[PDB]
Amino acid sequence: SFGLGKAQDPLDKFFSKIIFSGKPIETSYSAKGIHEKIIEAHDLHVSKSKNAPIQYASVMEYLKKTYPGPDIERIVSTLERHDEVGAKDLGAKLRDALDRQ
Prior knowledge:
Blueprint: H1 70-82, H2 88-94, H3 96-99
Keywords: Host cytoplasm, Secreted, Signal, Virulence
Organism: Hyaloperonospora arabidopsidis
Family: Belongs to the RxLR effector family.
């Protein structure tokens, strides 16, 4: 028998571990809220700190040690395509190694 109200609606993905997936590199970086959406979905306690200390400077980069080049140029272009204010820091900084030396 056929009935209405049994199927679920499409999700915008709440996981940020898509960068290490392989094939998906558009949909995720094509949706609204790719970098600043995981803070509202849960939103608990003031400031989230686990391994990032605050003394002088805190920076972590791994997209330049195991990555060759085209992979980085792909992520930046996909982020600067829609113009996201929550991901403008991610894309621009990754594309700041070509414009700024």
